[PDB]
Structures are given as structure tokens and as C-alpha cells.
Design a protein around this nucleic acid. Structure first.
Ligand code: NI
Ligand code: NI
Ligand code: NI
Ligand code: NI
Ligand code: NI
Ligand code: NI
Ligand code: NI
Ligand code: NI
Ligand code: NI
Ligand code: NI
Ligand code: NI
Ligand code: NI
Ligand code: NI
Ligand code: NI
Ligand code: NI
Ligand code: NI
Ligand code: NI
Ligand code: NI
Ligand code: NI
Ligand code: NI
Ligand code: NI
Ligand code: NI
Lengths: 95, 271, 267, 94, 273, 264
DNA sequence: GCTACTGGGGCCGAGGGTGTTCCGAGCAGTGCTC
DNA sequence: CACTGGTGGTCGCCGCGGTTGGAACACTCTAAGATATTAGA
DNA sequence: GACCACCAGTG
DNA sequence: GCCCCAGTAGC
């Protein structure tokens, strides 16, 4: 039972409703829940199979030094970077 | 891209809905108010959705609820179960034929009944006793147990009276609502595991016999005492207090996680 | 065992009777004693009073597709009458009764009775051979290129048009078959020929009338080769089930198949 | 140590930087971290003190039935509702 | 709002910053690349921030990092510590006066030294041995341990050389050990400062500006940090610094060193009685 | 010696600390010409500069304007253990601690303390003299005095606000001085327990000489945002009087009166 | 970025042989101040 | 509603008695017909 | 020199 | 009658 949060941007309403099937949409495109590993992987299958055009990010609680992990689908101005294993987020300029 | 139900242990206990139309918007379970206030319901994460009077469900809504494996339960006043819709084939043939085989043979049926007794009262049933005798012992033990909980919680008690006619007496309402919650999640569990709720051993004849057996096993261990506690405080909203209290009880007791292995260990009498 | 199909409306209760309010305003008052089963097609909205009434009079509600093409949900889930479930289960557990029911299924599917020497597995092999020859014979009758039944279970769009039409047709047939098994009060998982699967009885009863109409219709749609063959086969099976009243004719067939076990029915 | 998510809306940049001190801004206004209870309470002090005119909702992992809880600050079209103990989100129409 | 610091155990081990200028944007610790890529950094959620050559921190950045209790460590080749900056008054008077009282008396000092020896090696030190003799025994045991790990991982060994000034052409093992133990000295210094002690008031090491850090870190150095550096040196990769930082991060997470550092300090100083 | 740098970037040119300004005026600084560098707001430090200051052992202290606040400092926790153990030995011994307290009293008030007085008795004398000074300044500058009343900001009396700000600045420069000299701000003699006790002591020595009468001088007026006015007035007083430079010998004499061999 | 509106079209995403691996101080005149 | 840009204005956000489970595979059977293996259940 | 506050314009 | 899909501004 790990906590999950999924932030979608510019996805079709199909993925939004599908995420609303299991997760709670607290804000526009921000879904929160508490799922297991398999359920999380299935949710990521829904995202990778239905995002199509937008950018989605999924973060879940783990035993890492940061306490959580996250992966992305699509492109966004905020790109994850790897700092010696500690993955942060960088903000790309226009271009 | 398919849509499949999640296991029962990873779900929440129940969600009560009332006064509003239940639609499917963009593939999601949505409860629309008379004022237009849309309220999404994570149907895939709930074990059962109780539909109080005033709920107008749509065809796509019952379809979606059935597809994600979430039992729909139309309830009346005090949460008493009226109807239910679920997967038309959620039963696994091996477990269903096993349950039916134990129900047909009277020897294995007696084994399962005595196993239910021993799991209920923590001591083996008296030997060479029939099913009717064990049921009468169950009646006296349950009566004296209601009395003992009444004297311990300081509640005025005179009898069960599950018919809301003689209520006018909040303790019976609290017991009816609490045991209604337990029957909802218990029927949901029995449907999920692949068994038949109508094929029972103790409460034979009734359409939800197995639900009454399994739930009657663990009723007083968790759910009824909390109903007496809610009844002693005498709140203005007994239904809400009983629902919230049962929710906390199911959470702390891991009821959804223990329901299926309870069924397996009960039916495990006839090797 | 009577039933009615409601579609495109809201089901309320007026003066203690089921009413189906249409988009145009055409009320359809239904007395509680006139129907024992209500099939809810797409486009219907159910009110709480209607479910309470159907519950208190014991009316079965089954949310289905159009003409019972798919069975989405059903009231009284897991089986309502326990005596019918234990009747079907008793028929399926005893090997003699099971073989009797299987033999009746054979005699109903093909006009000729099966050889008496054979067991369930041998009758299964005979079934396989006859179905093979039927696939070939239909393939020649409708003039469609036939390479076999093999399809790709992972991706639907990787199979032949004929396999798509057959698969969709058998899907709809499992729809109406499941509707008949639920309306009759029996468990779809308790099968005789097919076993182990949660819809084995659906496969058993559906295999009896499969190649009588719906599969030939699938070969016809495959011959015409439309743009959307799955939708054309589904609507074609819908029209077949509506025009020929397949669901109505299935329930006596179920009761007779189970009746050939020579055990007293629940009734 | 529990997981923390803070999603802000129409807040001055002071609160966005302050939240950037302890949390990871993975999306525009969406912050994710792993903090203790007292650190969470302090972060909420920052949120309530700095939002002033925006709506910020914070959720954290717990041992409740849903596995997490959340609270809001400021008005929003998505308002929390209580369903017999289980807190969901309703969308107020225009 | 005061923004008070976070406990050290809840923080992340370390973050290395290689190039760009470090600014404070709306109160945020931001690393700006020469291409314009802004990278916000949770300065409040990390124990120590390492600054490699090429970084140009601002005044508000040092003010912010100090205010949230995050140690700044300027490093050079293989991340060997060059400088540091922290709170100007982040030391607790009671613990500092206790450490000082232990350092002043010769007897208490010898007690703390014997505690360090007993916690470092699996056997207590011989009795009535002075500080110099125990330091020599420590030197011999440490040399034999270096040789032993070198023979276990099969690395061409010549002897421990601390500073990169004495490095030769292809000496990579001392580079890996120096980077790893540099990380350990970083988090150890951050723990000593956070706990309120003085990093310069040492017992085994004396006179060096980080004597106590070298003591506390030398206690638990060889348990996990050094042999992993011998392993990475055996692999001989292309980017040894990043690999050593990865392995040290996973060791600090697994052994939970950042949380155990302060109890080790208090248990070492406790022997002074 | 020390130098204040502000409004420019600190780099290294041919082995020297260079301060580069927006006007293009380079400020070259040899490695041995400064013992400490006070970094005011507006300074960005290059890595080579910190590396050079480390190689030559120069202290870097990030402060506010004229050391009004002390935000950070290099060599955290002190780099010289000898001075730390010197102050600590002065603090743990009752005789030496009493000697240092008496020196603080003699350097604060123009007359030596009454003999055979304990630290708590000298503390009471100190409190009484402080009260008489508060009343005297209130009468001199014509400020309505009610006491040292403050609610732990704006919802309070203005005079206590000005006094609070002024003492904050003085704790700033005093902290910068204690850090520059190489001693711990937490090890105090009169004040004990808090991490800035020594700052409160040395600041208490010179508190009512300049900064507090200036706080009452601004309280005599009624300007908007008295915090900024008091902070700026204290800044200009610390620059004009060279308080940071004069505070280090004061510390060395206060600790020196313990009659201990001081570190060189 | 998200959200509301509003006709037009479709009722739709399947396929089944089987089971088994609280306390000091002062000091002014009981309160202030440290 | 988030991001961007330029210019004027500040260098600030304080106080200080001490201490107490699922899929890979392994199979039955039959009738056509490569009279062996294979397609269908 | 570094950094914040303000006020729209655009997608 | 219910629901998805597409375009179309609007902030
Ligand atoms: Ni009962
Ligand atoms: Ni399929
Ligand atoms: Ni050492
Ligand atoms: Ni304050
Ligand atoms: Ni003082
Ligand atoms: Ni957004
Ligand atoms: Ni719309
Ligand atoms: Ni429309
Ligand atoms: Ni329309
Ligand atoms: Ni239309
Ligand atoms: Ni299709
Ligand atoms: Ni097969
Ligand atoms: Ni007097
Ligand atoms: Ni800008
Ligand atoms: Ni500008
Ligand atoms: Ni400007
Ligand atoms: Ni300007
Ligand atoms: Ni006080
Ligand atoms: Ni032949
Ligand atoms: Ni079949
Ligand atoms: Ni300028
Ligand atoms: Ni219509």
C-alpha cells in the first residue's frame, strides 16, 4: 500500500475518467490514491496507452532516500535530471 | 485497452450515495446532484456502493460498476439491504462446485456447521448435536450476548426486533445499520471470491444464506459492540455515526482482507 | 418464465407498477405480476423505487445490451434460488447424470443421438470433428477463403475477417445464452461438457444452436465484407435474436437439457 | 516519514519558492516530498500564511482507510465533501 | 514566517553541483546552467550540498542554505573538501561545553579515545596505553586493513595517500577511496555541526581543522565505505566520481548513517562519564 | 584586519582576490592582506575564490550591511580549537568565569564591581542599572516609557520595537566580531545556555553607549517603518564608529582578564 | 493550460478442449530588569 | 491560470535572566486422410 | 549587483 | 435516453 499521485497535462478525457475510476481527482488533472505495485503498473499502462498527446507524471512512495520515485510520459518544459542517482527536475527555457 | 477489477483487500469498505442521479461521464462513476454539483466516485476502489433512496442509476453506471468488480447495493431506511447488482458470472466454477458439493452432502454440511460454531464461540460445539440443536444454541448464545453487551454498555435492551415497525429505541437501529454494513461487505467478498451467496449451511432457505453464515461468524467480534457504543451516546444522526464507526472497525480489523480466508477455512472442514 | 425488454427511457413506479417513460413521453405501465424478468437495454435509467418494487416482488433485473447481445450486470447476483443451483450442481457432479445431460445436449445439437458406448471426452472429440467439417462446408457454401479458426488473442485487428465475424457472432450468442441461463435461475459456471471456466454452462448451451443461424450469418457478413464487420455481425445477431425470439426459446431448452438427468426439478 | 503532495493555484511566488525549499516541483504548482508530521504541519503553516488569495490543497499518506488524507485552503470549484467519514471531491457548477 | 530547519535524519544524504551559477529565485535554491536551464534544488531537504569547481553562489544562496540548516561544502578533485559554510551560531552550548570538558582533562580525553578504539575495531584497546601509542596501533591496523581489502578485491596497492596532491598518473584506487571518504566526511561534518558540537575539537586527531570529523567518521569508515571504493576501483570505470557518489548514496541509505551519526557521537563522548 | 565587500563578484586574478563591480573598478587583494572578508548583500563568490581563501586560511563571513546581521560564515563551528578551548576553560572554572564577569562589569560601567559579589548578584546590579538607564533615556529623549514589554511584532509599543531592532543590529556586529576573533558565540559568562550568549554579553557591554540612545532618538521622531530607520541608523553608526574593528580587542581584553595564557 | 457548449452518431471493443507445474539576584520606594 | 518581460526600490522580516498467485506446458479424443499428423472441441 | 514587487499579454 | 467525439472559443 504505497501512496500514488498522477499529474496529467493535455490528455484526452478518456484517460481522465479512467484515472477517476481508481484515483481521486483533487485538482484539475491531479489524481491521488493509495495502490499496490501491480495496480500502479496497470495505471501506468492506462496512461501510456491513453495519454497519446499530453505529458503525464507519476510519483509513488518508496524506500528510496528521497522517499518516493517518479516517471514521466511525453514531453514537458520540466524535465527530470539525474544528479548522481538523485533525480531532480530542471526547467528548460524557451527553445 | 481493457479494464479489470482490483483485489478486494486494496479497496475501501463502502460508499453511501443518496439524492442524485448516477451517470458515467468520460468513463467515470459520477454522482450528479439536483443542483448540478458533480461528484466523482472512485468506484474501482470501493468494495460496495450503497444506493440510498433518491438515486437514479444509469445503464452505463451499472455496467461500469460491474466491470470494475464493485457491488451495487440498493438499500432502504437504516441501510437495510433491498437489492444488489454485480458481475453476472463472478463465481469461479471450482469454488462454486466445491461449495455446492459441501452443501449437498449432509455429512460435510454438518462438518461446516460445527466448524462455524467453533470459529464463532472459540470452543468446539457439543458432540452428537444436530444442525437444529446447534442453531438453537446459537439463538440462546446470541440472545445472552446481546444482553451482556447491553448491561456492559448501559443501554436499555428488550430484544432484537429487526423490523423497523416497533422502533419509534436507537439501539436496534444501530445494530441494523451496522450489521447491514457487514452484510454488504460480506456479500461483496463472497461474490468476489467466486462463491454463491444463496448456497448456505446454517441460515438455509434465505436468499443470502452464506452471507448470513460468514457475517454471523464475526458479527459480535467487531461490528455489534460498536453499534452499542454508538447507541449509548444517542446522536442526532445515528446512521452516519454507525457508518463511520463500522468503517473504522473494518479498517482496523482488516475485515476485507480476512473475509476470503475465513470462507476458505470454514469450507475446509470437508477434506 | 415471462420477461420484457426496456429501452431508451426511465423506469419509475406509478400506482405500484413499473412504468417506462420514453424520450417522447410514452409511458409503459407494467404490472408487477405480468413480468418475471426485466432486461434493461442501453439508454435506461433505473429509479430507486423501481428497484425496491422489483425486490419486494422478486423481479429479476438484468442490465444487458440491445436484444441481450451482452449481459453487463444482473440483480440477485451469484444466483437467487439455491435449489436450482444445487440442482444443476448435483447434475454436474455425478458422472452418470453429467453424461446423461451431455448426451441430451448432443442429441439436441445434432438431430442424431450420439453413440452410447462413448464417454464425455469421446463425445468432445466427435464434436470437434463435426465442427471442423462444418467450418469447411460453410466456407465453401459462402465462398470465403478459409485457413482455419486460429486467431491472435492479444490483438483483435490481426485476425481474418471470417474469424472476426465468427468471434463476434459467438460473443452475441454467449450474450443471449447467458441471459437465458440467468433468467432460468441457473449458474453459468456449472458446466457439463465445458468445465473449469466461469461461463462453461454458457458454452454448453450456446454450442447447441450455434451453427443453426448465427455462424452462417457470420459467414454471410464475411462474404459481403463490410468496413466494420464486427459491428455488422453484432447488429445482425441482434436482429436474429429479436426476430426469431432466441432468448424465449432458450429457457425451455435449458430446462429440458437439465431435465434429461432424470432428477426431479425444483419447480 | 510519509509522502506529501501540495498542489497550489493562483498563489504568489513566495509560497512557490518556500514550497520549493523542502518539496520537489514536478509540475507547475505540484509539489512532492517525503516529510514527517511536524514538518508537514510547518509546511501547512507556510501555506496558510503565504497563499493569501489562492487555493492550495495538501494531501499526505496516513493509515486511514483510503491511505491518505487532504485539506484545502481557499475557495475552489473542486470542494471536499464528507460521505459518512470518507472525504471525496465534488465539482461545483458555474 | 521563520522557516525553521528540518531534522538531519529526515534529509537526503548529499547533492553535487558541477557548473552554473547558484541563485535564489523567489526564495528558492536554484542552479542556473550556462544554457539557461533552471534547476530548483530542495536545499532544506538535503544534509549537505557539494559545490564543484564552476559554481558561483550568491549571497542570498548562502543565506538561504545556512538558514535552512544545510551545510555548504566546496570541493575540488574527487570531491575532497575545500571549504564549508553553515550557521554562525548553530552550536548548542551544553553539548559544546561537554565536548570541551572532555577535551580539557587528560583522563576524560583518554576515555573518549579508548571508546573510539573500542567502537572502531572489534576488540577493546590495551589498558594503560597513552594516546600516541594507541594512535600508532591505529595506524598499523589501518595500514593492514588497506592492504587486506586491496588483496581481497585484487587492486594493485601501494599505500594510502590522502591528498590528491600526492596522486600519480594512474592511481585510481586512492581516487575512489578519497571520493568516498570525502562524502563520509561531508555528512559527518554536517552531523557534528547540526548536533551542536565543534568539528575542530578532536580527541584522536588534533590540530587539524576537522579533527572530530575525522574521528567520528574514521570510527565507521571501513565498515562499508572503503571496500566499496575498492570494488569500484577494481571495475575501473570511466566516470569514477559519479559511481562512487552513487554507491556512497546507497550505503548511506542502507546503513542509515545520517540518522546514526549523532547517537554515535553521544555514545563516544558518553565514555568520558 | 578585515575588509567589507559588496555589490560585485569575487573571483581570482593571477593569485589575488579580485572584486569586480558594475562600474569596472577591479579591487585586487593579496592572499595575506586580509584575515577575514565580510560579504555584504550583493556579492557572488566564485569557486576559485573560496578555494584560495581555503588555501591561505582566510575566513569568509556572509553578513548584512555593515554586519547588521550575520547570515553565514566559513569554517563553521570555528576553525581554531585553541581559542575554543581557551574560552571554554575560561567558562568552566568558577574562579576564571567570575573574573571574566567582573571584567565585563568594569568595561561596561565606568567603575569596578563591588567585591565579593557573585554572578547572580552582579546580574541583579546589572538589571537595576539597566532599568535606571531606561528611565533616564526615556526622560532625556522624551519618550513615553512603560517597560521592556513586547509580545513574542507590529502589535506593540514603538519604543520597544526600536530597542528590539537596535539590539538586533548590535547582536549582528557583535556576532561578526566574535566569529572574526575565532571564538564561539554560544559559550557565555553572564548569559548561559543560548547559542548566542557571548554575543549578548559583549553586546551588553556597549549596548547603552550608542545604539540604544539612537533607538530612543528615532523613537523621539515618528517615522514610518521604524525597523528600517533603526537598522540603517545602526548601520551608519557601525560604519562611522568602526564598531566591528573595536569589538575584537574588547573581546581579547575581556577574556584576557581571566589571567590565562592567551593563544597567539 | 483547462472548461463549457452543442449537434451527430452509436448503443460497440469480443474469440473458450482440460488440468497441472520554579528559581536566583539586586534595588527602588512590592514591581523591574537581567 | 501559468509564464514572461522591464523598471523602481531595497539590501530587512528583529525581541534575549537561567534552570527544571498466473501462465507454460502437458495432455484426451476423433475423424479426416501425408493412414501420419492435424484441425477442431 | 542580487533580488523582489508590480502589471498586464498570450496561449 | 445515455454517452463519446469533434470543433470553438474564452480566460
Ligand atoms: Ni443469523
Ligand atoms: Ni480477445
Ligand atoms: Ni584518521
Ligand atoms: Ni519576533
Ligand atoms: Ni543581556
Ligand atoms: Ni494546471
Ligand atoms: Ni458539453
Ligand atoms: Ni448534444
Ligand atoms: Ni443529439
Ligand atoms: Ni442523435
Ligand atoms: Ni472495432
Ligand atoms: Ni486448445
Ligand atoms: Ni532608596
Ligand atoms: Ni521576469
Ligand atoms: Ni531588472
Ligand atoms: Ni534595475
Ligand atoms: Ni535600482
Ligand atoms: Ni524573565
Ligand atoms: Ni477417409
Ligand atoms: Ni464447445
Ligand atoms: Ni548597483
Ligand atoms: Ni432517442
Amino acid at each position: 500500500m504505497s501512496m500514488l499521485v498522477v499529474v496529467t497535462e493535455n490528455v484526452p478525457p478518456r484517460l481522465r475518467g479512467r484515472l477517476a475510476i481508481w484515483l481521486l481527482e483533487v485538482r484539475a488533472g491531479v489524481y491521488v490514491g493509495d495502490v499496490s505495485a501491480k495496480i500502479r503498473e496497470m495505471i501506468w499502462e492506462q496512461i501510456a496507452g491513453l495519454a497519446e498527446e499530453g505529458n503525464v507524471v507519476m510519483a509513488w512512495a518508496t524506500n528510496t532516500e528521497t522517499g518516493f520515485e517518479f516517471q514521466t510520459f511525453g514531453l514537458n518544459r520540466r524535465t527530470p535530471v539525474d544528479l548522481d542517482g538523485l533525480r531532480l527536475v530542471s526547467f528548460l527555457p524557451v527553445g | 485497452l481493457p479494464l479489470n477489477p482490483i483485489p478486494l483487500k486494496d479497496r475501501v469498505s463502502m460508499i453511501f450515495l443518496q439524492y442524485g442521479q448516477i451517470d458515467v461521464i468520460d468513463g467515470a462513476f459520477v454522482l450528479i446532484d439536483k443542483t448540478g454539483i458533480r461528484t466523482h466516485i472512485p468506484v474501482g476502489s470501493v468494495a460496495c456502493i450503497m444506493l440510498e433512496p433518491g438515486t437514479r442509476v444509469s445503464h452505463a453506471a451499472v455496467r461500469l460498476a460491474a466491470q470494475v468488480g464493485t457491488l451495487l447495493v440498493w438499500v432502504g431506511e437504516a441501510g437495510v439491504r433491498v437489492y444488489a447488482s454485480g458481475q453476472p458470472g463472478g463465481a469461479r466454477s471450482d469454488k462454486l462446485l466445491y461449495q455446492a458439493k459441501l452443501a449437498l452432502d449432509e455429512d460435510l454440511r454438518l462438518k461446516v456447521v460445527r466448524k462455524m460454531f467453533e470459529l464463532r464461540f472459540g470452543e468446539p460445539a457439543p458432540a452428537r448435536r444436530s444442525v437444529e440443536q446447534l442453531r438453537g444454541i446459537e439463538g440462546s448464545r446470541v440472545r445472552a450476548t446481546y444482553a451482556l453487551l447491553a448491561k456492559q454498555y448501559g443501554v436499555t435492551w428488550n430484544g432484537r426486533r429487526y423490523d423497523p415497525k416497533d422502533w419509534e429505541d436507537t439501539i436496534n437501529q444501530c445494530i441494523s445499520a451496522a450489521t447491514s454494513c457487514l452484510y454488504g461487505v460480506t456479500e461483496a467478498a463472497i461474490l468476489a471470491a467466486g462463491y454463491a451467496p444463496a448456497i448456505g449451511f446454517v441460515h438455509t432457505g434465505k436468499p443470502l444464506s452464506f452471507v448470513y453464515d460468514i457475517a454471523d461468524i464475526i458479527k459480535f467480534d467487531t461490528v455489534v459492540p460498536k453499534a452499542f457504543e454508538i447507541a449509548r451516546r444517542n446522536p442526532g444522526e445515528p446512521d452516519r455515526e454507525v457508518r463511520l464507526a463500522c468503517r473504522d472497525i473494518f479498517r482496523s480489523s482488516k475485515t476485507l482482507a480476512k473475509l476470503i480466508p475465513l470462507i476458505e477455512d470454514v469450507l475446509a472442514a470437508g477434506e
